[PDB]
Design a protein around this ligand. Structure first.
Ligand code: FAD
Ligand code: CL
Length: 487
């Protein structure tokens, strides 16, 4: 007979899952498996992102239960669990969506040879990205494009991405009954308390495929907003209704298919001939994700500076005092501190909000390494993506792709263009809720009488600015110019 395993790592969804469709084909029993390392915390990761993953697994569990099946959350490591369940369940075929991250390449290679000894077929479709990223490199002559302009000219020569896979059957072959490793008491989806977390998550974005499809349909409620979407023109201070889709955590964990997003975009574009074009368009934003995956997967040490062939070698400062102030949202600049507070409470900020805080730490004011700042974002971002976090932190540090180090955002004036009343600041920094809008971006310039009337004295209730931006940015730009000259 045919007994199969659909292994979930990313792609936590039932729609557009070519691995699941193959796993269910002619199968007597299908085993939906997610491998969980219970010692992950005792080895880093916020409860915001981990609970978002748990909520995603609960959505998969309710979707499988509604079709006569059941999600199995196996504890342990894949190299140790799979050899056992192969022979316990009589597995003949193992299916899982392809992954191009460095750890996945080593992990899958080990499971591929474990399945071979067990006489198990391995099927690994590509569905996390729009295209086969190895195909894009081969068609480009054997190298990956290093600019968005050249990348977009390549994908347009390749053509449309593959259409999203059809839906799985309404009834799925269930796991075999009375299997010891498939017992519900050891294969259930745990909560954030049971995995060893003390404080609860505070984010407002719920995980799972159902929420991903609901936020997708809400974004496409106004097709004119979708067709005329221009990323550099969106509002980073909009928090009640974010100015962008906020689909990045769903796309990261695979709760939403990128190919489904792309096909829905083309449907709107055919009806709106004046739709925006890449890179500013919504489709361009998916291409940014596709471009950074293509470059990073073919570049060694892409998440580091040393040994990175695309990253410039800058003598970043080792200043733990400045890093602690930026990380703990006490820089003394309310625009920066409010975004850093939104980072640790929601796990998501607007793209230009991330521009402000990444530039402030690196080439703008503090001259701290982009690796140190990437580590802080990897812990708290619920949309943390290995290749996307890395490429964008090298972008904002003027280490790769971007090179115009004279463009320095001001921590005072950037947000004031969008939100002169400081509504974004008053929300995430309630210690400044009574400060008048004249000084809300520069609280150290408010008279002492005003600081007391507002109940926020600089130095007692809110810290003073750690640096003078006019002086700090002048020094940072001079050092960046001396670096691009020694190259
Ligand atoms: C320092 C820094 C770190 C970042 N780290 C991450 C990260 O870990 N994970 C992450 O998903 N994005 C990251 N980004 C990119 C960007 O900030 C987010 O993708 C965006 O804020 C997500 O909002 P959205 O889903 O509403 O995007 P939209 O504007 O609605 O775009 C839709 C989708 O396109 C993709 N996308 C959009 N912008 C980019 C971009 N600049 N690069 C790559 N893909 C993009 C995402 O999948 C996103 O969900 C980072 C950017 C910076 C400056
Ligand atoms: Cl500015």
């Amino acid at each position: 007979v045919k007994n199969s395993i659909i292994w979930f790592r990313k792609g936590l969804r039932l729609h557009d899952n070519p691995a699941l469709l193959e796993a269910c084909k002619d199968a007597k029993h299908v085993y939906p498996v997610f491998v969980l390392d219970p010692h992950f915390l005792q080895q880093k990761v916020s409860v915001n992102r981990y609970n978002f993953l748990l909520e995603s697994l609960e959505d998969l569990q309710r979707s499988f239960q509604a079709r006569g099946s059941r999600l199995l959350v196996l504890r342990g490591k894949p190299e140790e669990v799979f050899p056992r369940v192969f022979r316990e369940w009589g597995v003949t075929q193992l299916c899982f969506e392809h992954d191009t991250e460095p750890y996945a390449k080593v992990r899958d290679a080990a499971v591929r040879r474990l399945a071979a000894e067990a006489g198990v077929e391995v099927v690994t479709p590509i569905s996390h990205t729009l295209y086969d990223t190895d195909m894009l490199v081969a068609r480009n002559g054997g190298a990956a494009p290093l600019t968005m302009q050249s990348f977009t000219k390549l994908v347009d020569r390749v053509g449309d991405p593959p259409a999203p896979a059809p839906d799985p059957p309404a009834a799925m072959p269930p796991p075999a009954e009375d299997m010891p490793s498939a017992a519900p008491a050891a294969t259930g989806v745990p909560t954030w308390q049971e995995v060893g977390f003390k404080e609860p998550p505070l984010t407002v974005f719920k995980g799972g495929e159902t929420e991903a499809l609901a936020r997708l349909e809400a974004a496409f409620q106004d097709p004119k907003w979708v067709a005329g979407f221009q990323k550099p023109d969106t509002d980073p201070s909009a928090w009640e209704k974010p100015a962008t889709t906020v689909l990045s955590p769903y796309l990261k964990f695979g709760c939403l298919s990128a190919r489904l997003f792309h096909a829905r975009l083309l449907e709107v574009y055919r009806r709106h001939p004046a739709h925006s074009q890449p890179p500013v368009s919504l489709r361009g934003q998916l291409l940014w994700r596709e471009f950074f995956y293509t470059v990073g997967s073919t570049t060694p040490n892409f998440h580091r500076m040393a040994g990175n062939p695309v990253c410039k070698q800058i003598d970043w400062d080792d200043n733990p005092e400045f890093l602690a102030a930026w990380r703990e949202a006490r820089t003394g600049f309310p625009w920066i501190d409010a975004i850093m507070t939104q980072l640790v409470t929601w796990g998501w900020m607007h793209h230009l909000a991330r521009h402000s805080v990444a530039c402030f730490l690196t080439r703008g004011d503090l001259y701290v390494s982009w690796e140190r700042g990437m580590e802080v974002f990897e812990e708290h971002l619920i949309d943390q993506d290995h290749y996307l976090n890395a490429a964008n932190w090298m972008w904002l540090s003027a280490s790769a792709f971007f090179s115009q180090y004279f463009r320095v955002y001001s921590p005072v004036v950037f947000g004031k263009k969008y939100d002169p009343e400081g509504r974004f600041i008053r929300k995430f920094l309630p210690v400044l809720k009574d400060m008048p809008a004249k000084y809300i971006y520069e609280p150290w310039t408010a008279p002492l009488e005003v600081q007391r009337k507002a109940g926020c004295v600089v130095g007692r209730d809110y810290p003073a600015p750690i640096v003078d931006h006019a002086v700090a940015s002048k020094a940072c730009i001079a050092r960046m110019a001396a670096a691009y000259r020694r190259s």
